[PDB]
Ligand binder design. Sequence first.
Ligand SMILES: [K+]
Ligand SMILES: [Mg+2]
Ligand SMILES: [Mg+2]
Ligand SMILES: [Mg+2]
Ligand SMILES: [Mg+2]
Ligand SMILES: [Mg+2]
Ligand SMILES: [Mg+2]
Ligand SMILES: [Mg+2]
Ligand SMILES: [Mg+2]
Ligand SMILES: [Mg+2]
Ligand SMILES: [Mg+2]
Ligand SMILES: [Mg+2]
Ligand SMILES: [Mg+2]
Ligand SMILES: [Mg+2]
Ligand SMILES: [Mg+2]
Ligand SMILES: [Mg+2]
Ligand SMILES: [Mg+2]
Ligand SMILES: [Mg+2]
Ligand SMILES: [Mg+2]
Ligand SMILES: [Mg+2]
Ligand SMILES: [Mg+2]
Ligand SMILES: [Mg+2]
Ligand SMILES: [Mg+2]
Ligand SMILES: [Mg+2]
Ligand SMILES: [Mg+2]
Ligand SMILES: [Mg+2]
Ligand SMILES: [Mg+2]
Ligand SMILES: [Mg+2]
Ligand SMILES: [Mg+2]
Ligand SMILES: [Mg+2]
Ligand SMILES: [Mg+2]
Ligand SMILES: [Mg+2]
Ligand SMILES: [Mg+2]
Ligand SMILES: [Mg+2]
Ligand SMILES: [Mg+2]
Ligand SMILES: [Mg+2]
Ligand SMILES: [Mg+2]
Ligand SMILES: [Mg+2]
Ligand SMILES: [Mg+2]
Ligand SMILES: [Mg+2]
Ligand SMILES: [Mg+2]
Ligand SMILES: [Mg+2]
Ligand SMILES: [Mg+2]
Ligand SMILES: [Mg+2]
Ligand SMILES: [Mg+2]
Ligand SMILES: [Mg+2]
Ligand SMILES: [Mg+2]
Ligand SMILES: [Mg+2]
Ligand SMILES: [Mg+2]
Ligand SMILES: [Mg+2]
Ligand SMILES: [Mg+2]
Ligand SMILES: [Mg+2]
Ligand SMILES: [Mg+2]
Ligand SMILES: [Mg+2]
Ligand SMILES: [Mg+2]
Ligand SMILES: [Mg+2]
Ligand SMILES: [Mg+2]
Ligand SMILES: [Mg+2]
Ligand SMILES: [Mg+2]
Ligand SMILES: [Mg+2]
Ligand SMILES: [Mg+2]
Ligand SMILES: [Mg+2]
Ligand SMILES: [Mg+2]
Ligand SMILES: [Mg+2]
Ligand SMILES: [Mg+2]
Ligand SMILES: [Mg+2]
Ligand SMILES: [Zn+2]
Lengths: 83, 23, 206, 60
Amino acid sequence: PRSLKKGVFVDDHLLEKVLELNAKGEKRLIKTWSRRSTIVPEMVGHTIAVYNGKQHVPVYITENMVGHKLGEFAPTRTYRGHG
Amino acid sequence: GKGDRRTRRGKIWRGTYGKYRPR
Amino acid sequence: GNKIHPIGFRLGITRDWESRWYAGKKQYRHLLLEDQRIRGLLEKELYSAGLARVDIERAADNVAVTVHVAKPGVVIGRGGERIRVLREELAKLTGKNVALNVQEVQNPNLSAPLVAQRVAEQIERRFAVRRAIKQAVQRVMESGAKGAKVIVSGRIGGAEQARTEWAAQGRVPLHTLRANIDYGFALARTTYGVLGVKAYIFLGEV
Amino acid sequence: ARKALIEKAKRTPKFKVRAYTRCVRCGRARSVYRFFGLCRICLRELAHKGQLPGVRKASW
RNA sequence: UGAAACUCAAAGGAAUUGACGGGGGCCCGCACAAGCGGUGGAGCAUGUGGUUUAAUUCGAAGCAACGCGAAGAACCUUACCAGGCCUUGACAUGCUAGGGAACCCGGGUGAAAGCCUGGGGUGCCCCGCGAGGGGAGCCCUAGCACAGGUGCUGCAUGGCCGUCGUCAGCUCGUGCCGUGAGGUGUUGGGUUAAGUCCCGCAACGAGCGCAACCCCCGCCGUUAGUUGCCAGCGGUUCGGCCGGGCACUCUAACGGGACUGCCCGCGAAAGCGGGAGGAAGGAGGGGACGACGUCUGGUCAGCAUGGCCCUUACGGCCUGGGCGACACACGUGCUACAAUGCCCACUACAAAGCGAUGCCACCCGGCAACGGGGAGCUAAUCGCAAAAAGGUGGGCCCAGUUCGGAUUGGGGUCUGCAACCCGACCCCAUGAAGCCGGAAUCGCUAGUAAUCGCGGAUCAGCCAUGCCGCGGUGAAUACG
RNA sequence: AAAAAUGUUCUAA
RNA sequence: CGCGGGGUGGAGCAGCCUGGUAGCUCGUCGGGCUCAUAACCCGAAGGUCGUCGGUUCAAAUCCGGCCCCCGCAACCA
Ligand SMILES: [K+]
Ligand SMILES: [Mg+2]
Ligand SMILES: [Mg+2]
Ligand SMILES: [Mg+2]
Ligand SMILES: [Mg+2]
Ligand SMILES: [Mg+2]
Ligand SMILES: [Mg+2]
Ligand SMILES: [Mg+2]
Ligand SMILES: [Mg+2]
Ligand SMILES: [Mg+2]
Ligand SMILES: [Mg+2]
Ligand SMILES: [Mg+2]
Ligand SMILES: [Mg+2]
Ligand SMILES: [Mg+2]
Ligand SMILES: [Mg+2]
Ligand SMILES: [Mg+2]
Ligand SMILES: [Mg+2]
Ligand SMILES: [Mg+2]
Ligand SMILES: [Mg+2]
Ligand SMILES: [Mg+2]
Ligand SMILES: [Mg+2]
Ligand SMILES: [Mg+2]
Ligand SMILES: [Mg+2]
Ligand SMILES: [Mg+2]
Ligand SMILES: [Mg+2]
Ligand SMILES: [Mg+2]
Ligand SMILES: [Mg+2]
Ligand SMILES: [Mg+2]
Ligand SMILES: [Mg+2]
Ligand SMILES: [Mg+2]
Ligand SMILES: [Mg+2]
Ligand SMILES: [Mg+2]
Ligand SMILES: [Mg+2]
Ligand SMILES: [Mg+2]
Ligand SMILES: [Mg+2]
Ligand SMILES: [Mg+2]
Ligand SMILES: [Mg+2]
Ligand SMILES: [Mg+2]
Ligand SMILES: [Mg+2]
Ligand SMILES: [Mg+2]
Ligand SMILES: [Mg+2]
Ligand SMILES: [Mg+2]
Ligand SMILES: [Mg+2]
Ligand SMILES: [Mg+2]
Ligand SMILES: [Mg+2]
Ligand SMILES: [Mg+2]
Ligand SMILES: [Mg+2]
Ligand SMILES: [Mg+2]
Ligand SMILES: [Mg+2]
Ligand SMILES: [Mg+2]
Ligand SMILES: [Mg+2]
Ligand SMILES: [Mg+2]
Ligand SMILES: [Mg+2]
Ligand SMILES: [Mg+2]
Ligand SMILES: [Mg+2]
Ligand SMILES: [Mg+2]
Ligand SMILES: [Mg+2]
Ligand SMILES: [Mg+2]
Ligand SMILES: [Mg+2]
Ligand SMILES: [Mg+2]
Ligand SMILES: [Mg+2]
Ligand SMILES: [Mg+2]
Ligand SMILES: [Mg+2]
Ligand SMILES: [Mg+2]
Ligand SMILES: [Mg+2]
Ligand SMILES: [Mg+2]
Ligand SMILES: [Zn+2]
């Protein structure tokens, strides 16, 4: 994991998007490509569109998934098994 | 064995140092 | 394909380098890139002069490019004006005090890098490839060489089925270290593709 | 996609972690040695020509 | 006795060069045999098939494709996919027109690219107490010429490489034989690692190969003596540390040395068997070195290069994804299944390499990864550094274990803009399969195999258990 | 004095 | 609604008699040998027994109906 001598990582551009919504009485649909930005308490209750390489998957963020990265919830490979 | 990282033998294998192989 | 370069094989026993200098790890590549940028310019400009070997020496923010050549008067030009037309354009890409020297090659037909360029141009001019080889190997032997060997690979005469042709006279001991075998390759571009011209000149054993 | 990748490699990048060595002679990206600026192939072509100062075919 | 229709562009004869034979003869190669260790079963690492996928870029295909191109895929790399963007363009030389700039510091929007923007202020020779007007590195906008393509063809190609095979061979010039292909030479007797050499001979020479010249290792000599070494007197905080010395060890350049030169025996000879001297003996051990050719071998994706093909797109920029997928199958490896072992502590003996946003002594914080301090070294000086197996002491007592270390939970560390996909390391916990592997199959003939560790290239980091090197310990066996 | 069958079409560069 | 026999892995046959146990050859799939294929060698998977119903603790096996498929018979006028 990221050395906590450094901060918790959010790309800033995504972080603005959510702090405006809280201030203005949220929420809008947030479409970002920052799969790496850590889910941060200022996100709970919102829904972020995460680009998995093809589509922006919606992701409703709850309290029990905070320490995670956004990419964890938009998988990149579709499987369905073998014939 | 060399695969057991928690030993003075496995640390020699990965070339690393720790409580189980100090300097 | 299996045979090793006769120059690289003899480097240190019969062939000295074309670039001689020392440079600690911190700037070998920079002097090396410069060395290549120089040779590129001169091999282009001094092509019609009969370029055979660019020696590049270097010491302390200065460089001594020594061009061995068939027709030195072509390189120098009018009284040393075309010579200095390069002595400064060289120093415009050298930055250093880039001293230029010109050397006379005693025999052109004894210079493997030129024989190959001669035959390469003869195919570009659509001469008979078989004849054009036997002619060149003939001149090298008349010029006193102890043995010569010349090779054309490619679409000889534009034949769809590409081919290799060669001829050799005297002897050419590629396995001997004390043999002095000048080697020269030239590339012949034609309308039907590219052609490879290899020249081996046995000069003698030392 | 080659010549525009010789160019993009020379340029200074958005992050120093995005820089990669390319052969100065042929532009190859893999097997390029730091000491020469050359890939493992051009290293062999210039070596045999004698245009590489003081390098000699090793043997032991 | 004996047709025809129809149908083929041959059917044939001898001889030649090859290739082939479950024909022959004579030879060789870890080819078998004799051995020793493995692979095939396990878990994992990696390469591939297949499937999957928006894409899982592309190539490699029996030996000689499969830890191969990849000597470093998180972004870059990247050639694939998705979406957002650019259009003389990221890049080259040339021509114009309008600005008339050169360059450096911002700003709005956006994921970024991009698009829209804002500042100041260009010399060059000029007319100068004037407006300055021009012109010029180089910039920028429009217009073109053109760029660009890892798009296709390795069955159009150069170059480079693999392979047969370091196998002993492949040929030429003149002469001779034959109507001719072609033969002779190069075959034969002997000998060699060898078309190596000897004798013979309608052949006589020659060339490419073999050998040799070259590099490392083995003994001795010269030359040198610091950063290397310490034999012997002086100190000595007891460290070659100081005096001092270069003897030795070493370091690195030039030399000597082995040639069947000598003796016995055989033989016509070349040679072969043995002996002596000698560090080394029959080419001392290892390397580099690969004939004419083969395989329409391999590589247009390293590069080059003909032709075909695309041109607001098959070019270019970006962000994200993918190259790491997983019902399966194969190759190459790592780790082991234990007691000739495992574990902890103490303690010895290497070599070759690397090291100035480098290697890091020592110091404190920390169980540790590491962190903070902080000397020395442009390095025979300072550092990576501990080499490990080993030697000693002690613990485990035959258990799926104090064997094994996969898998998984949690907690950290570090490089990096950033470790979700997808990093490496550290610590607590978890502690799977595996009891020596079916049919089948690999390597090695000596300082080899086996086993032990160490370094380098790539490299921010690293999926390295891979590769290229390095020494430590050190066998078994070959009747044939 | 012999276990053991087979190798699609065109092309031979 | 004259009398017999049969239906079970993909094919062809055991197992039913005597209720509890599904078996044999080929085929199919994974590996191996071969340059490759075949043969050959090493492994593995696939059948709820035509069907419905009954007896029984328990049915491919025993009993009754239906479906399907072969065989025999049909004489005296
Ligand atoms: K009757
Ligand atoms: Mg253990
Ligand atoms: Mg044309
Ligand atoms: Mg290119
Ligand atoms: Mg990089
Ligand atoms: Mg690189
Ligand atoms: Mg005949
Ligand atoms: Mg054997
Ligand atoms: Mg095994
Ligand atoms: Mg296995
Ligand atoms: Mg695939
Ligand atoms: Mg391709
Ligand atoms: Mg890969
Ligand atoms: Mg790798
Ligand atoms: Mg990429
Ligand atoms: Mg990209
Ligand atoms: Mg093709
Ligand atoms: Mg080819
Ligand atoms: Mg080729
Ligand atoms: Mg191909
Ligand atoms: Mg032969
Ligand atoms: Mg003749
Ligand atoms: Mg005859
Ligand atoms: Mg005649
Ligand atoms: Mg003849
Ligand atoms: Mg022959
Ligand atoms: Mg002959
Ligand atoms: Mg022969
Ligand atoms: Mg004969
Ligand atoms: Mg030999
Ligand atoms: Mg003879
Ligand atoms: Mg001395
Ligand atoms: Mg040789
Ligand atoms: Mg081919
Ligand atoms: Mg092409
Ligand atoms: Mg290309
Ligand atoms: Mg398997
Ligand atoms: Mg491995
Ligand atoms: Mg394996
Ligand atoms: Mg280290
Ligand atoms: Mg257990
Ligand atoms: Mg068990
Ligand atoms: Mg245990
Ligand atoms: Mg975890
Ligand atoms: Mg990762
Ligand atoms: Mg046991
Ligand atoms: Mg075994
Ligand atoms: Mg051997
Ligand atoms: Mg071991
Ligand atoms: Mg590295
Ligand atoms: Mg991994
Ligand atoms: Mg290593
Ligand atoms: Mg048949
Ligand atoms: Mg046809
Ligand atoms: Mg059935
Ligand atoms: Mg059946
Ligand atoms: Mg019965
Ligand atoms: Mg019974
Ligand atoms: Mg059965
Ligand atoms: Mg099968
Ligand atoms: Mg074949
Ligand atoms: Mg088969
Ligand atoms: Mg069975
Ligand atoms: Mg019934
Ligand atoms: Mg039953
Ligand atoms: Mg009657
Ligand atoms: Zn290159």
